[PDB]
Amino acid sequence: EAPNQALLRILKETEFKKIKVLGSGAFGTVYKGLWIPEGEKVKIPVAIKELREATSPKANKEILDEAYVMASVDNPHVCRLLGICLTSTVQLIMQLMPFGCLLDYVREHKDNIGSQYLLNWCVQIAKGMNYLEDRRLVHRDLAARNVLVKTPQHVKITDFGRAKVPIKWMALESILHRIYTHQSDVWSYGVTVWELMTFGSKPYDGIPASEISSILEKGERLPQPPICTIDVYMIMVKCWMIDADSRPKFRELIIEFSKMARDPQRYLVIQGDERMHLPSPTDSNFYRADMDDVVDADEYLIP
Ligand SMILES: Cc1nc2cnc(Nc3ccnc(OCC(C)(C)S(C)(=O)=O)n3)cc2n1C(C)C
């Protein structure tokens, strides 16, 4: 009912340069880039999305619905659209998340991921999701692959191509009745937590997608990760109840994981936890790994 007064920024092709390919899939190609506005003495590191095949009117429509959703959000734990460039194909300008997706991040850096990071990431994902809930936006595709890493200490939720099939992250009402709610996103959040807690394991590995519905109906759920106390596992289990209303709310998940983040070694048991470290601005050459006048999108022309 409330008018959507979000601003759609049209950016000139000449103002940004593609540096390298970051990812390539069904979505098309994502490039690492630099955005150098008009004459503002700033360089903004950006991620540029462009579709791999054709210049079809159907492709342009799909990318513009994604732009509408990404331009309508504003939260530290959600990815916002910076702007669009109206080339023949039309491309999305987004914030560069230098450390990639959280799924690949936990797989590649498992030996240095301590309980503090895991629990803080759970808080951040719940904050983003609670924001999406307050904006009445149902994600429908929450997974560790869709959580991006700005810094190891700061993650954001992305992928709004489904926001208003990934069966192994879907709630029961979603598979059987196509019912999607903020409570069906809670189930997905449970699987995302499981992914993190197992340092990037594949949920129901080897089991075909058509067998998931039957498995869930029998009462089978993902197993207790070896680092998880019954406290952390019980939360995951509550996200996977049949009754959507019995599942935790995102605001409760923020509270529960925050309490745990205060004494993380009491809730996750990780061998050599205290001797583990990940990059932070404290690191020599943290930003180093044209570097003059560069500023992050979060500090530039704030909405
Ligand atoms: C490997 C990698 N490095 C990245 C650095 N920065 C971003 N920036 C952003 C910001 C918001 N949204 C996204 O992309 C999410 C996708 C892939 C779902 S998209 C481009 O289709 O919207 N990337 C994305 C990056 N990736 C992708 C392709 C997962």
Domain of residue 127, CATH code? 1.10.510.10
CB within 8 A of 70, min separation 6: which ones? 79, 80, 81, 92, 94, 160
Is 273 marked active-site? no
Q: What is the dihedral of CA 301, 37, 152, 130, to 10 degrees?
A: 40
C-alpha torsion 17→105→52→32, nearest 10: 0
- For ligand 1, the distance from its centroid to the CA atom of residue 56, given in whole angstroms, is 23
Quick check: 191 and 143 in contact, CB under 8 A?
A: yes
Range of the domain at 44: 1-96
User: Are β-strands 91-95 and 44-50 bridged in parallel, bridged antiparallel, or unpaired?
Assistant: antiparallel
Resolution in Å equals 2.4
**Residue 125 within any structural domain of the chain:** yes
Written as six digits, the tokens of 175 are 């598979």
Dihedral, 72, 78, 83, 87 alpha carbons, nearest 10: -100
**Ligand 1 geometric centre to CA of 214 (Å):** 34
In a domain, 80, yes or no: yes
Candidate of 158, 159, 160, 298 to mutate for ligand 1, largest count of ligand atoms within 8 Å of Cβ: 158
Residues touching ligand 1 (Cβ under 6 Å) are: 22-23, 27, 30, 47, 49, 79, 94-97, 100-101, 148, 158-159
Number of structural domains (the chain) is 2
Indicate which residue's Cα is closest to atom 20 of ligand 1: 49
Q: Of the residues 66, 96, 126, which one is the last residue of a structural domain?
A: 96
CA distance 172 to 44: 42
DSSP string, 12-34: -GGGEEEEEEEEEETTEEEEEEE
| Same structural domain, 143 and 281 | yes
* Cα–Cα distance measured from residue 104 to residue 153, given in angstroms and rounded to the nearest whole number: 15
